Amino acid sequence: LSPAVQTFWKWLQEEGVITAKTPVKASVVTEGLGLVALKDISRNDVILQVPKRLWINPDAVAASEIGRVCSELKPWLSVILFLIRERSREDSVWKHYFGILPQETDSTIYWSEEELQELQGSQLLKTTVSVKEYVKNECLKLEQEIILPNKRLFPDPVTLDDFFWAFGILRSRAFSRLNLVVVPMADLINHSAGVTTEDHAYEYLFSLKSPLSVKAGEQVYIQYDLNKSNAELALDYGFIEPNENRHAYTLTLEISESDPFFDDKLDVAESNGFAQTAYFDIFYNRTLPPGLLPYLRLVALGGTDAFLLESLFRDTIWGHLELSVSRDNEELLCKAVREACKSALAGYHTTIEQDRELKEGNLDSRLAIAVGIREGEKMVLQQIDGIFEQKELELDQLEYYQERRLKDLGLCGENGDILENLY
Ligand SMILES: Nc1ncnc2c1ncn2[C@@H]1O[C@H](C[C@@H](N)CC[C@H](N)C(=O)O)[C@@H](O)[C@H]1O
Ligand SMILES: CNCCCC[C@H](N)C(=O)O
């Protein structure tokens, strides 16, 4: 199979990890390296169980030679260093493990500038840049505060490449729900859309249980996360899914401070669970998130309907926001959204037709990722615009505040005056 791999498999054996009740070996699969069943495996059938003696989480770093210096560092920053450090030590307990780790993944955090150009105008590009920058600073401050000082624990220099290396390793390998633990064995099982149960973590050791009945020769998979968008999967790991329901685009709304009614609006927003700035994730084919419309109406409020910000309504204001304020309010927010969508759609360099034709051929993993992501984002953008386009049509089918107030007027009651004269 592989010198470095075969050597890694020997290591797990000389540790009690892989005994005989381990129905799985490693192999070269389209998705890198994976676990292939040596014998049939049934649902929830235990596959592997590595002893905590072999983790690489905050607790393991706090108990190593650098456990003192990283005493007050954020959990991930601590593991980043630990990982870089052990990677150099020829006497490390993971000497064989590291000889297996991929230097890179297809995460956007490794893409070249040309590769990144394929994501031009995409929300994913923005998210990736932000994250790259952040990690950079946080990592450079580490060099000057923990690496350079203790030139005794860190003999060799430390480049950004090494930093992003460890960050990537952490974000595409560690297990969240249990907090940022890593397991040299379980670190090999890949993701499949076949899995829809999501729940394979258990435990001192790490107990991994196959959520599916794999036949001998086949690969053992798991579901990384059902709720992530394709943009999220693209950054965290280096892949995405064809499933159009994974496409999402998040909108960001806010109550500007330049708004003449800022103070009252912020009061209304916070009193109902929303901050000065709010993020609404919009997934394809899914209905608009609750709160998006009422928050949009609050943003668009305006002088005419400002009377709703009075103490008198502080208890029902949100209810009115959910039902609708007025035709001018509604019409304003619709144009705002629709223009934002058109404006955004115009930032991409390919049409959806071109993306779809490209997908009909063979594409390098990174290009395939950019094409699927940008196509998806365009679908969401166009769906959002269509939703509000209808809205602009049905602009008069909504019963606004005024009309709702006169519904119960009782114009046609009784001839009250007959009783008014009886006393
Ligand atoms: N469904 C998938 N399609 C493509 N790559 C995948 C998939 N699931 C996992 N991976 C890869 O596996 C890596 C993350 C780890 N969970 C697994 C290690 C990987 N099998 C290796 O050979 O190192 C990521 O870098 C992904 O590139
Ligand atoms: C070997 N990589 C593990 C993937 C972890 C996926 C997700 N964070 C979880 O906790 O299930």
HEC assignment per residue over 254-316: ECCCCCCCHHHHHHHHHCCCCCCEEEEEEECCCCCCCCHHHHHHHHHCCHHHHHHHCHHHCCC
CB of 280 closer than 8 Å to CB of 251? yes
**Single-letter residue type at 210:** S
Return d(Cα 134, Cα 171) in angstroms, integer. 14
Return d(Cα 151, Cα 372) in angstroms, integer. 45
Return d(Cα 56, Cα 49) in angstroms, integer. 15
Residues 234, 245: one domain? no
The method recorded for this entry reads X-ray
**Single-letter residue type at 79:** V
Instruction: Compute, in angstroms, the gap from residue 418 CA to the centroid of ligand 1.
Output: 84
The residues with which 222 forms a beta bridge, in sequence order, are: 191
The number of residues in the chain equals 423
Number of structural domains, the chain? 2
CB of 121 closer than 8 Å to CB of 344? yes
Instruction: Give phi and psi for 108, each to the nearest 5.
Output: -65, -15
CB of 332 closer than 8 Å to CB of 302? yes
Residues 206, 280: one domain? no
Return d(Cα 49, Cα 339) in angstroms, integer. 54
The distance of Cα 275 from the centroid of its chain, to the nearest Å, equals 20
Does 417 reside within a domain?
no
Which of these, 165, 184, 183, 167, lies nearest to 175 by C-alpha position?
183
Q: What share of the chain is helix, strand, coil (3-state, %, to 5)?
A: 50, 10, 40
Last residue in a domain, options 186, 212, 240: 240
Residues 205, 349: one domain? no
Return d(Cα 87, Cα 174) in angstroms, integer. 17
Expressed in Å, this structure's resolution amounts to: 2.5
> Is 92 strand, coil or helix?
coil
Residues 175, 318: one domain? no
**Single-letter residue type at 381:** L
Instruction: Compute, in angstroms, the gap from residue 262 CA to the centroid of ligand 1.
Output: 47
Q: Which domain holds residue 209?
A: 1-240
CB of 41 closer than 8 Å to CB of 47? yes
Cα dihedral sign, 222-108-360-362: negative
Does 357 reside within a domain?
yes
Read off the tokens for 38: 């040596």
Residues 35, 2: one domain? yes
Does 227 reside within a domain?
yes
Does 413 reside within a domain?
no
Q: Which residues of 15-34 are buried (b: 16+ CB within 10 A; e: fewer)?
A: eebbeeebbbebeeeeeebb
Which ligand minimizes its atom distance to the CA of 103? Answer: 1
- In sequence order, which residues have a C-beta less than 8 Å from that of residue 162 and are 6 or more positions away? 84, 87
The residue behind tokens 């309907």 is: 305
187 known member of a binding site: yes
Residues 350, 207: one domain? no
Read off the tokens for 59: 């607790």
First to last CA, the chain: 104
Which DSSP letter does residue 65 get? G
15 known member of a binding site: no
